[PDB]
């Protein structure tokens, strides 16, 4: 953004690509950093009572 409409018309007139739409200026699409911290669980183990190392 922050451009005049005449040079936007020239950018569309140069090639049919619609440069206003996707423009290689990532503004706020990046997720806002320092979210609340997410937990990292454990999958097919760490349940008790069966998980022998003799088996797997």
């Amino acid at each position: 953004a922050s451009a005049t409409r005449l040079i936007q018309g020239l950018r569309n007139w140069a090639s049919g690509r619609d440069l206003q739409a996707k423009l290689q200026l990532r503004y706020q699409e990046i997720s806002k950093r320092t979210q609340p911290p997410p937990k990292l669980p454990v999958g097919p183990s760490h349940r008790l009572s069966n998980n022998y190392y003799c088996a797997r």
């Binding site: 183990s45 760490h46 008790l48 998980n51 022998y52 190392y53 003799c54």
Partner: protein, 230 residues
């Protein structure tokens, strides 16, 4: 004539009477994991690690101290063999403190090598692990009483070879302490030869204590000096 047929996983070998399961397995090439046995010390069945399964045997025995009858067959890769060893390994590593950095036998442990090659991985017993106060056994041997797995190898060594006989066990059950009751220092001959015998890093060297680490030192043959025995 004193040549006894035992089968290691099916393969025959002749074994003298009185010699154990373990000397048969050392004859064929096997080893059994063990703590309270030592090949040049006395024999008792304390540490329970050396359990093994015989074909047609509903009673799992400790292979360190078994008189060998004629015609056995020994499973060293079976199901409940590994189950019993992993169980005992989860037992031994409960009252042992998280000291493997600050231990001096970190490169040359035994709990570590057997817990890799024979142990489980996802532990239990979320709360506990009491600790024991130390006392200096002397100026030459640094002593932490906490890492003692109570294997009773130093004690029988003292009782049968050293003859000083000041190192026993006190208390019962969980609360068993090893070493000295009357707080008397141990300054006799071969007092440095207990750092090679203690299979965990409990009784370690005082002057050596924190100057190296075993995986960084290259070794060289040498001959004993200031003696005549070498």
């Amino acid at each position: 004539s004193n040549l006894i047929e035992v089968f290691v996983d099916g393969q025959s070998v002749m074994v003298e009477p009185g010699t154990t399961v373990l000397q048969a397995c050392e004859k064929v090439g096997m080893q059994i994991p063990r703590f309270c046995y030592h090949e040049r010390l006395s024999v008792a069945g304390n540490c329970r690690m050396c359990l093994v399964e015989i074909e047609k045997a509903p009673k799992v025995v400790a292979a360190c101290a078994m008189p060998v009858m004629k015609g056995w067959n020994i499973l060293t890769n079976s199901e409940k063999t590994k189950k019993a060893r992993e169980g005992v390994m989860e037992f031994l590593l409960a009252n042992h403190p998280l000291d493997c950095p600050i231990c001096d036998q970190g490169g040359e442990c035994d709990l570590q090598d057997q817990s890799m090659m024979f142990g489980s991985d996802r532990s239990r017993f979320l709360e506990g692990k009491r600790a024991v106060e130390d006392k200096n056994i002397g100026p030459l041997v640094k002593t932490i009483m906490t890492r003692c797995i109570q294997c009773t190898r130093c004690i029988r060594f003292a009782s049968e070879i050293a003859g000083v006989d000041d190192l026993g066990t006190t208390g019962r059950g969980n609360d068993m302490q090893v070493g000295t009751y009357i707080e008397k220092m141990f300054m006799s001959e071969l007092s440095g030869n207990i750092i090679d015998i203690c299979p965990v890093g409990a009784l370690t060297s005082k002057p050596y204590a924190f100057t190296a680490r075993p995986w960084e030192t290259r070794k060289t043959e040498s001959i004993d000096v200031m003696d005549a025995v070498g």
